């Protein structure tokens, strides 16, 4: 079974963390493993491949059985081609290479300053928030709201939008509101849901 390497650049764009499993690896326990990578000057190749010139990366086994390798500092637009060099009993056995661009694997921070206010005269709840400092790319937002104690979610695609106003069946009820964001172009991860804001 091939080895899947997944990477994620932090919300501050200072480092990229990569992980690889050992569950579909227990069959060949007797073997030495080492992550190898080749950094491109700019962007990823259309077809990733094993390169003769490569450098090893220090990976550390975590409690969950996954190896974690941290690339710091990071070159946001340089193509990182990675693979697992396996030496089971003799020779070299390279896992399928995958190329990752750190800018397209950023998991942004949850949007700061979430406010949920019900204005009776208007009859709506003006949910407002502040975009996380990074990334600088356009962002899409997802808002989840429901009775504090049943969840309908709303999506906002205007990148230049800070606030929105939605209807509720009861203007007296207390509603919990959470917001999360992702790169509008899809090249990135969703942020965690923000701390719940109450009406």
């Amino acid at each position: 079974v091939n080895i899947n390497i997944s990477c994620e650049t932090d919300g501050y764009l200072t480092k990229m963390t990569c992980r690889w499993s050992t569950s579909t690896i227990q069959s060949l326990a007797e073997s030495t493993l080492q992550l190898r990578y080749h950094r491109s000057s700019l962007y990823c190749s259309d077809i990733p491949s094993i390169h003769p010139i490569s450098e090893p990366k220090d990976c550390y086994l975590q409690s969950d059985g996954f190896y974690e390798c941290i690339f710091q500092p990071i070159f946001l637009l340089s193509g990182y081609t990675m693979w697992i060099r396996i030496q089971h009993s003799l020779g070299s056995l390279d896992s399928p290479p995958t190329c990752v661009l750190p800018d397209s694997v950023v998991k942004p921070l949850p949007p700061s300053s979430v406010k949920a206010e019900i204005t009776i005269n208007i009859g709506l709840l003006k949910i407002s928030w502040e975009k996380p400092v990074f990334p600088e790319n356009n962002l899409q937002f997802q808002i989840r709201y429901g009775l504090s104690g049943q969840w309908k979610m709303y999506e906002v695609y205007d990148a230049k939008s800070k606030s929105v106003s939605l209807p509720v069946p009861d203007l007296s009820a207390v509603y919990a509101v959470q917001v999360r964001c992702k790169r509008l172009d899809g090249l990135g991860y969703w942020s965690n849901w923000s701390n719940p804001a109450y009406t």
Partner: protein, 94 residues
């Protein structure tokens, strides 16, 4: 890789470096300017400067891709921010 996305990624990388600077607190001239700043940043290494210096390397490469297709630390980074913001709007006039 499309050239328009290279341009979108160049403008984005500039905004990132400008944001990096404030958080602490034609193409030939842009490249020549970045080269001078890289030499300055190499004489004052720090956690933030080293990261910024790496971004500067990525920005210079992006400038070359476009051509062929067709505290002293605070003061130094403050001037660099000015130069970066200058390039950011000049790239639109293409």
């Amino acid at each position: 890789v499309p050239i328009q996305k290279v341009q979108d990624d160049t403008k984005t990388l500039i905004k990132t470096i400008v944001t990096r600077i404030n958080d602490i607190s034609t193409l030939s001239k842009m490249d020549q300017t970045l080269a001078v700043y890289q030499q300055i940043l190499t004489s004052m290494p720090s956690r933030n400067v080293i990261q910024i210096s790496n971004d500067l390397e990525n920005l210079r490469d992006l400038l070359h891709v476009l051509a062929f297709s067709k505290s002293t630390e605070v003061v130094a980074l403050s001037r660099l921010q000015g130069s970066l913001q200058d390039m950011l709007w000049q790239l639109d006039l293409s």
